[PDB]
Amino acid sequence: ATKAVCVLKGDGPVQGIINFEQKESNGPVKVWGSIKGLTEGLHGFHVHEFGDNTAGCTSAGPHFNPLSRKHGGPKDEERHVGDLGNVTADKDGVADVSIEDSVISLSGDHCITGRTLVVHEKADDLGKGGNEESTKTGNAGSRLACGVIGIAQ
Amino acid sequence: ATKAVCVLKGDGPVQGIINFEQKESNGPVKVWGSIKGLTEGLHGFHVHEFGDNTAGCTSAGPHFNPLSRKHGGPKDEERHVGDLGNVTADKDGVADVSIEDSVISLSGDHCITGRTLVVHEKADDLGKGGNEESTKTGNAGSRLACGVIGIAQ
Ligand SMILES: CNC[C@H](O)c1ccc(O)c(O)c1
Ligand SMILES: CNC[C@H](O)c1ccc(O)c(O)c1
Ligand SMILES: [Cu+2]
Ligand SMILES: [Cu+2]
Ligand SMILES: [Zn+2]
Numbered sequence: 001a002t003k004a005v006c007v008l009k010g011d012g013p014v015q016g017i018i019n020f021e022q023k024e025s026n027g028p029v030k031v032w033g034s035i036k037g038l039t040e041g042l043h044g045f046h047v048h049e050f051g052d053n054t055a056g057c058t059s060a061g062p063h064f065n066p067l068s069r070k071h072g073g074p075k076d077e078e079r080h081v082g083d084l085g086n087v088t089a090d091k092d093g094v095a096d097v098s099i100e101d102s103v104i105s106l107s108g109d110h111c112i113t114g115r116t117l118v119v120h121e122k123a124d125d126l127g128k129g130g131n132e133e134s135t136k137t138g139n140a141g142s143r144l145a146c147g148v149i150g151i152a153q
Numbered sequence: 154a155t156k157a158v159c160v161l162k163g164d165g166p167v168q169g170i171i172n173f174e175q176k177e178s179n180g181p182v183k184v185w186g187s188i189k190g191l192t193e194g195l196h197g198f199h200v201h202e203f204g205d206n207t208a209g210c211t212s213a214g215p216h217f218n219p220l221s222r223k224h225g226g227p228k229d230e231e232r233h234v235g236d237l238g239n240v241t242a243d244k245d246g247v248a249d250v251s252i253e254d255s256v257i258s259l260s261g262d263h264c265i266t267g268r269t270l271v272v273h274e275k276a277d278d279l280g281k282g283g284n285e286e287s288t289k290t291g292n293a294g295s296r297l298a299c300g301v302i303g304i305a306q
């Protein structure tokens with residue numbers, strides 16, 4: 001298996017730890033961990049193109065989109081590679097993350113390692129919001145915490 | 154051609170920002186930037202194996218060493234891929250980083266993206282210190298600041 005990891009931090013209360021594991025080359029990737037400091041409800045959760053945190057999470061650029069598709073949800077055919085949908089925080093402000101995804105990878109052109117994982121202010125509408133921005137960002141709003149995805153032991 | 158970036162964080166603050174550029178995949182990598190908050194003198198400067206900062210800089214593991222060599226300086230044949238020598242801080246606590254290196258890469262087996270850059274407490278003796286630990290770490294001591302090396306625009 002191949003593994004990766006991301007420590008999420010920002011300017012406010014949101015912080016988290018996310019692990020990635022890919023059992024076989026080009027296979028599905030398990031994504032799991034925890035994020036705290038969130039408002040209760042859905043928060044957009046995406047891999048953004050650049051692993052650049054120079055000026056904070058803004059430096060990461062748009063959703064990782066090597067195939068030049070429109071924004072969608074993780075279970076849509078029309079999605080960005082980085083479109084991992086939403087995480088859900090409960091009234092503890094904690095999102096317990098447990099995802100399996102078949103489009104991200106830890107190698108090749110779909111590789112997310114060296115890019116930035118971001119948790120957003122608002123829900124991602126998965127491209128179903130009916131304004132222009134829905135099919136670009138999902139209307140998920142600002143970036144609360146982020147980190148560069150790194151190679152893990 | 155290809156670019157990467159690393160935000161170093163670390164108490165002091167020891168903080169920095171380091172840029173990487175490789176004009177072609179078969180070619181040297183320019184490494185430049187600034188680190189502040191340092192004590193005057195040499196500080197070991199290495200790429201470590203893992204881009205894991207789960208528990209801080211310790212989680213990054215040993216120097217990146219894909220070829221199973223002993224520790225050295227960047228000019229040596231016998232070196233780790235991650236061996237970038239020392240940065241040298243003045244009384245003002247600032248090290249100006251300007252390195253060109255032909256062993257690290259931003260693509261291929263020696264790719265450093267997704268791994269951790271670390272600035273250390275003490276000087277790296279470049280493998281010439283005479284104890285055993287010179288041949289593993291250069292006796293550069295603890296990890297003052299680190300960050301995961303990410304893909305840049
Ligand atoms: C921590 N164990 C992860 C598990 O081996 C696993 C589950 C689903 C996957 O798609 C995968 O690649 C790996
Ligand atoms: C980028 N993700 C590829 C996916 O996990 C995948 C693996 C094998 C296949 O045959 C396939 O059609 C898709
Ligand atoms: Cu996002
Ligand atoms: Cu080091
Ligand atoms: Zn998207």
Ligand SMILES: [Zn+2]
Binds near residue numbers: 223225
């Ligand atoms: Zn070394």
